[PDB]
Design a protein around this nucleic acid. Structure first.
Ligand SMILES: Nc1ncnc2c1ncn2[C@@H]1O[C@H](COP(=O)(O)O)[C@@H](O)[C@H]1O
Ligand SMILES: Nc1ncnc2c1ncn2[C@@H]1O[C@H](COP(=O)(O)O)[C@@H](O)[C@H]1O
Ligand SMILES: N[C@@H](CCCC[NH3+])C(=O)O
Ligand SMILES: N[C@@H](CCCC[NH3+])C(=O)O
Ligand code: NA
Lengths: 506, 505
RNA sequence: GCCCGGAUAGCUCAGUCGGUAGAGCAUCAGACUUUUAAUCUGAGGGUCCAGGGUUCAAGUCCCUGUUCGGGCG
């Protein structure tokens, strides 16, 4: 019964509390963890009893078998590993205490065992208890579901239940933490300095992404949540710290879907006296080392549409394949499109749209050249990016805050890393020209951010900082969630998030 | 004058750009870092000139001086280091580009020099330049003062200028980063797991504060920003992860002063099958190891107000002082305050009132015994906690989420680490009882509806999580900003914050 | 808003030609000093999605609907 069981258990616990039987002791001394116990006392043979050694462990019961009136088998489960407890009356303190403690213990209870190691006749590492102490009773029902919980609605809304019933989520979160730690260690070894930029920006920014508007009553003014720490990192680089990095949280006021969250974690770093070609090797080394360290090898098997779908085997050998966008795109399209310098020309946009219509592709109602190309590169180039692949310089239309090409015309010095036909690493070459940056900010604000409103989306403080002299520097960004999904074989962003945002019920 | 200088420099840069030459080169092949350069070539005898290799360094000019018309001395500052360059016509590429680049360069510009290491006979390490390349001109005029900019407004609003002129700011930020790194490493080697709890909640909860309300567009709902990542950690512990930790940002809708900020960073961990007395040693080892590893010794000199005032000396010797709150309060007062058990409602209120009137402690909100006794313990106990000191066994009605004392009654199982008369970290013994927890949450909700503003609402998810069974756990929380303030001899939070949130113009 | 098929113990489903609701899972009680998804025995558990007509007798016919899966606006 869903309701009657809770009421009965609550009444029993209240009765225990009434007659001087506390079910919530303040302290229990866990001498040894379950993992250490299993590692140490696994050398025992079947049917042994190490009566000399007595240790204290604690854990949550996951099963209760009644082989008789005086023999009860519990299954403690902690640290992701199980351990059987064989409660026998003859080895307990007393028969009365044995039958008293066994009555009050059920599945899911948090208990503390104090006993001697050994094994049964069949052979299993078990601790024969001398005195079982209840630590935290479980009032609610714990279902005994084989193969784990499968309803993908209480797994995300009740994460503790998912951790209790399912065991792979702990491995997923451990892998995510290990990824974060590896990134921190690598960037610290390279000499970077970890920083913490403000999350409450006065100016929202000329970005398309909707900001989370917040009101400050003491200063009676509107604060906008952080979208990217880019401007503050570049300000610090102007200040003198040539290498900065930050693995922080960015908030976006967009919808919630399979692979999108209102808040997410991104690792962003900026290094001075470098460029995208300099960061290509760094990204290669970091990604290959992370794949080799988290897993056991460079090979990773991913299921983009669940286990029942197609399994893709990617190889993370350090020599990633590098393809330049325009030379590869023209080949993939099958025809050579007009030169890059004709980006602004309407004729190039019309002919490119003719190509898209000829190849039967779909484009957003805005028919700008940026949309057409981003669609062309996303459905003829990244499709062949099953293995990790570097996409080179992109036209100046898409990336505003990237310097022009060293030799080519109208090409931003930037690169992207595509794995599993998805974008994980983006790296630009910072624009240190104050006049060009000012013009770009003004035009970006006037275009969409301030199309029919006040032109305040420009950051005068950042332009003033750039006026003081920014060294030739290069940035790099990483979406930690995407890498976590790729390394944990997860096709949902909610599988790698501890408490993902969900639509409220009722 | 600064406007005229900006106009002239902007015109000069436009003239530079129009006639082919590019004042913003795309990439400079920096070969060797400035600090490495100094460390490697400090062995040079004054007067040597290694005219056999060429190294390319980069930096920012901060002073120029022409010793005639052929020799020009610059001094680059990079990673907080000094490299004096003596450009001369003889070793340059040729005279014409030499005079051209000397006319083009000014003070504050960011340049890159390719040359040969050496040292003048005076004894100053230098790099003889073969070709000086200008990387980023400085349009504005850098102030020339031999002490660095001192106006607090200019220092905080323009942090890049502070880093450019002042030198201790970089050291302060490095110390803060090392604090965070040491905490992370210690907690990781203890076996903890780093987690990322949501910063947006449907309802407020976690600690007494005023939340930042935000509106969600797609889903018509108000999200309250994170105040403390406390409930989610306990839900995770219920899930099965015994040890968790998180160093993260918390947002508070208070005012802005020299100590408090709208946003700050704190480190919070939770350990299962432990208690506050178990954390009393862990946090002591934390603090002692941090101070030893960062400062270099166990003794710190801290100025409570200004570098010209009294300079207190705080010793972080690992055997800290553990003081009982009630016992020490009685010792300071002498008179025996009636026992915590009775709580003597409407009796001890008068008692504390006579103490505040006689002992002369100001009582702005005289309501409730909580405010009054907090006032007494502030004016009589934490004033002498120069060295780090644990203050344990606080009254129950102080803490709404600390388990009751096992031996005593009416006392909560908690301690606070007071260093330099300020709390840095505190620990709690978690209340795993679901019925008590629901009762206390109901009291908090009643206070929030009428009686309090910082109280939380009823979080039914956490109530269900506690109903599912929470082990006996202990929580610990430290304010990173105050530790950074103490370890960098800073009396203002804005010093340890990269971009402190000042009031607008 | 048009149309198709279901609505059964705490959960998943048989229910047959209408001869009164059962099987499994779950809970509880009992037996079983060596089990491992513990093994049996027993009990409670819905009052047939709601209202009706029909039938000797209606979950097991028909008529109005609500809900669900939806095929469609
Ligand atoms: N709403 C969102 N939810 C999750 N991840 C996001 C969201 N918006 C952006 N990202 C991630 O942000 C990273 C950088 O994206 P971009 O700013 O477009 O370069 C990528 O890894 C994206 O997946
Ligand atoms: N508005 C604020 N700005 C900065 N620090 C604060 C603010 N409010 C509280 N704190 C400090 O942050 C910490 C919060 O409590 P705890 O994390 O338990 O130490 C304490 O050190 C507080 O003094
Ligand atoms: N902010 C960028 C980093 C690239 C360099 C910025 N110019 C990102 O989100 O990845
Ligand atoms: N942030 C709390 C943790 C304990 C949670 C409430 N019992 C502290 O450091 O005191
Ligand atoms: Na049965």
């Amino acid at each position: 019964d869903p309701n009657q069981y809770y009421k009965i258990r609550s009444q029993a616990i209240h009765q225990l509390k009434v007659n001087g039987e506390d079910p919530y002791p303040h302290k229990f001394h866990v001498d040894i963890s379950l993992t250490d116990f299993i590692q140490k006392y696994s050398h025992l043979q079947p049917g042994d009893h190490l009566t000399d050694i007595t240790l204290k462990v604690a854990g949550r019961i996951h099963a209760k078998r009644a082989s008789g009136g005086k023999l009860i088998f519990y299954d403690l489960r902690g640290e992701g590993v199980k351990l059987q407890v064989m409660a026998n009356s003859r080895n307990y303190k007393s028969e009365e205490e044995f039958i008293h403690i066994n009555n009050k213990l059920r599945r899911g209870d948090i208990i503390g065992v104090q006993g001697n190691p050994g094994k049964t006749k069949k052979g299993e590492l078990s601790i024969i208890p001398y005195e079982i102490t209840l630590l935290s009773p479980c009032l609610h029902m714990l279902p005994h579901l084989h193969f784990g919980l499968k309803d993908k609605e209480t797994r995300y809304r009740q994460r503790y239940l998912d951790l209790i019933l399912n065991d792979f989520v702990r491995q997923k979160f451990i892998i995510r933490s290990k990824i974060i730690t590896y990134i921190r260690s690598f960037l610290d070894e390279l000499g970077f300095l970890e920083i913490e930029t403000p999350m409450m920006n006065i100016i929202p920014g000329g970005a398309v992404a909707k900001p989370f508007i917040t009101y400050h009553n003491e200063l009676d003014m509107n604060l906008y949540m952080r979208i990217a720490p880019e401007l503050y990192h570049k300000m610090l680089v102007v200040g003198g710290i040539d290498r900065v990095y930050e693995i922080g949280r960015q908030f976006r006021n967009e919808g919630i879907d399979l692979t999108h969250n209102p808040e997410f974690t991104t690792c962003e770093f900026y290094m001075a006296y470098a460029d995208y070609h300099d960061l290509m090797e760094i990204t290669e080394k970091m990604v290959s080392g992370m794949v080799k360290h988290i897993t056991g090898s460079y090979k990773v098997t991913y299921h983009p549409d669940g286990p029942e779908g197609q399994a893709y085997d990617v190889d993370f050998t350090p020599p990633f394949r590098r393809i330049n966008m325009v030379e590869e795109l023209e080949k993939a399209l099958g025809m050579k499109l007009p030169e890059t310098n004709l980006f602004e020309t309407e004729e190039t946009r019309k002919i490119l749209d003719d190509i898209c219509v000829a190849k039967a592709v779909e484009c957003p109602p805005p028919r700008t050249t940026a949309r057409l190309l981003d669609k062309l590169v996303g459905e003829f180039l990244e499709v062949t990016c099953i293995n990790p692949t570097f996409i080179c310089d992109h036209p100046q239309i898409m990336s505003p805050l990237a310097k022009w090409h060293r030799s080519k015309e109208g090409l931003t010095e930037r690169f992207e890393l595509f794995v599993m036909k998805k974008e994980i690493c983006n790296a630009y070459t910072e624009l240190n020209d104050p006049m060009r940056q000012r013009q770009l900010f003004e035009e970006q604000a006037k275009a969409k951010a301030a199309g029919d409103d006040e032109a305040m989306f420009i950051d005068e403080n950042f332009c003033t900082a750039l006026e003081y002299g920014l060294p030739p520097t290069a940035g790099w960004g990483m979406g930690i969630d995407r890498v976590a999904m790729f390394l944990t074989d997860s096709n949902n962003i909610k599988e790698v998030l501890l408490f993902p945002a969900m639509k409220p019920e009722d």
